[PDB]
Amino acid sequence: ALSPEAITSAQVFSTQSKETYTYVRCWYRTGNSHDESATDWEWAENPDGSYFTIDGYWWSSVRLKNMFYTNTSQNVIKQRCEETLGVTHDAADITYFAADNRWSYNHTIWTNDPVMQADQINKIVAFGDSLSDTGNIFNAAQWRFPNPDTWFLGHFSNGFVWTEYIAQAKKLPLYNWAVGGAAGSNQYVALTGVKDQVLSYLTYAKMAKNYKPENTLFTLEFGLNDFMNYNREVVDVKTDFSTALIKLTDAGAKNIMLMTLPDATKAPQFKYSTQAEIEKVRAKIVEFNEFIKAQAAFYIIQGYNITLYDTHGLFEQLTQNPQQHGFVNASDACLNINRASSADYLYSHSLTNECATHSSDKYVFWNVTHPTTAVHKYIAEKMLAPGAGMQRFNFHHHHHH
Structure with a gap:
């Protein structure tokens, strides 16, 4: 029964201060058309082949429905997935998530907004x-x-x-x-x-x-x-x-x-x-x-x-x-x-x-x-x-x- 108005500035500070890093799971449709729903994934990489990581913190109120909050833009994450997979079919329909390991669930990556924010x-x-x-x-x-x-x-x-x-x-x-x-x-x-x-x-x-x-x-x-x-x-x-x-x-x-x-x-x-x-x-x-x-x-x-x-x-x-x-x-x-x-x-x-x-x-x-x-x-x-x-x-x- 979590209520947003009950969350304190101390809980906010404690959550945000737990700075760590995670990996990016890049999913894609294996087949060349919308007829085939099957998907597979690979870990996002840097141009050099090393694993691509993102800095930030987690929050859930559980642990399995966790969201990762990063300053890295969605554009940068998507680009890393697109460049790592090397898939060329229009129906590749790439999606991505934060995951520490192969057994991790698909966690949404939230890009935190900047202070200098356009209206x-x-x-x-x-x-x-x-x-x-x-x-x-x-x-x-x-x-x-x-x-x-x-x-x-x-x-x-x-x-x-x-x-x-x-x-x-x-x-x-x-x-x-x-x-x-x-x-x-x-x-x-x-x-x-x-x-x-x-x-x-x-x-x-x-x-x-x-x-x-x-x-x-x-x-x-x-x-x-x-x-x-x-x-x-x-x-x-x-x-x-x-x-x-x-x-x-x-x-x-x-x-x-x-x-x-x-x-x-x-x-x-x-x-x-x-x-x-x-x-x-x-x-x-x-x-x-x-x-x-x-x-x-x-x-x-x-x-x-x-x-x-x-x-x-x-x-x-x-x-x-x-x-x-x-x-x-x-x-x-x-x-x-x-x-x-x-x-x-x-x-x-x-x-x-x-x-x-x-x-x-x-x-x-x-x-x-x-x-x-x-x-x-x-x-x-x-x-x-x-x-x-x-x-x-x-x-x-x-x-x-």
Whole structure:
């Protein structure tokens, strides 16, 4: 039950004073396409071949969910990984973490902000569920869920998710607090709800140096995993979501990206479902989407930088006319799964012959519920488009010759 307001300046000083070093684990997709989710890693090296280390300190409130705080930029770390791996395929999709040893978990590396800090967005912080999670439930599941041969290293897709595509387009670090709530995640110990992700984030941000919440772009999507796998009532999801935004804005957040939930009943899982089952899930999404719109409007009135993306509408166009958006199939899972369940995420599956023929980049769905990385990319492109909503955020704004 860690509370950021309980953390003392003495705990802050003691944590930061434990200066040490760690190594960098560089992950990459071994195959040349998004069809193959399998990954491997190597230790980052210096140009001379010696191991690349980073100086800094750890903090957790446990020890296994530890974050490493360094002054080394994300650019320098990524460059070391890119130069060490020597992989040339576009789908290498390199990711990196702090690790002392081969048995260590994948620890997020946080680059501490400088004292001389420009007034603009310098990082993206994500809150959410399996549509945003890049490795939290994976670490909690001891790298077993979602299966790393079928699902891209802790991601609930065959590649990067929408937040990573936005971070890459903006050239900003992405720090993920989203927790995958997909079927079978209940077997693992992790944050329940989006209010607790905000509380957890604030405790880690307390250990950061020169941190200014106004310079963070926060992203928030939640509700689908709760509605579909935990049979949660709308009233409870609304309370959790509302409380998370209250905590976030009360902590000094200024730039927040909100989004409506796509209608999960349009997914292949609901192909043969009764209208009663479809209506029960759809009613919850529709009601929750109207609530998100009112929450967005409320924070706009107060003077916050809010963008609300209609991802529900974007997804409706996609599933209704896939060929109009560069997709061949919006009705079947790309994976060969005949009896859908929690084993979609626990065990490995091959692509159907049909998906291998067209490629996973031409399919909307990876399994019966989760979309492919091409869909995440497509969504990010729509969000990043001129005048689509990114202009409301305090990004760097250049001069004109």
